[PDB]
Amino acid sequence: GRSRLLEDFRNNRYPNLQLREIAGHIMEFSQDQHGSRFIQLKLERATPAERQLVFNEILQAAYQLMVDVFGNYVIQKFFEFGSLEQKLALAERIRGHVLSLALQMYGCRVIQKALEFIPSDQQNEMVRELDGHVLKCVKDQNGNHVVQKCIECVQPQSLQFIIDAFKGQVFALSTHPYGCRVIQRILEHCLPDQTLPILEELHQHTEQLVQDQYGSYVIRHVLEHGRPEDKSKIVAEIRGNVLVLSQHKFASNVVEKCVTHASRTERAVLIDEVCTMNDGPHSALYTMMKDQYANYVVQKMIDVAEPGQRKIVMHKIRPHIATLRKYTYGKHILAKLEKYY
């Protein structure tokens, strides 16, 4: 049951209702779809005084609002465009509920918004609360975004305990749908004193990751953003095994990236691989050009190839226009000869 005021506001009997005019009914309006939207909108127009009028009523039951399907937007509003005193007050209502919040559907949205806007000191304080709950957090549909949020906003040295828990896990986590999301963030924001052990666990698993639904994602991330030496390491593993990884669903994609991102020289050595090396009757190319995955790799290959190497690959392909005609996964490889007709 809602106060007669809230209802009346629902029917739209207040076209110019003001913030002041709702005093004593914040909490109620904040837990209401439209009441919530109304407050949100108003806040922006509101003076510091007006704003504080709202802050007082919500501060008292902040916890409630933070886990509320509608309330949490109101709290987030204060974390962004709000006084430093207010943010600290809210940060303070967080003390001791971080984890439960982080695993919570609306709570986690507030934690994230808080992480972005509150000072380092309250930041680190929040982070701590996750100690010994990292993995549980990482594997949480809610918790994971929070974790990703720390890694990007928080000081990397307040993060060691994270790394610490990832030891002996990197592989398990890179094959997790939420876990691989955290690994990846970590590769972008963390210190070499921390990313050294991760890239290490990863290489020692390359062959497995490259065929994992999620493992490949991590791999592609390194091929696309990592250090040249860490790329080459990956590039070393794909060599000799190009034909097989290409008809695979997930390694297919990784192979394209090795291509797309390898040194000019590596890219020559891989392109040669499918032309020189053999698969029974014809070359690997003959086999790939008609596959449902490898046909993409051929394509990518033609695109990056140096004019010099483009010719052969083409030369090698031309002799089989007869088969590719009769193959759907190869109708693009056909037209591609246009580029080279």
Next chain:
RNA sequence: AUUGCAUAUA
């Protein structure tokens, strides 16, 4: 993903 893949609120 277009013949081939992943990302939690009104």
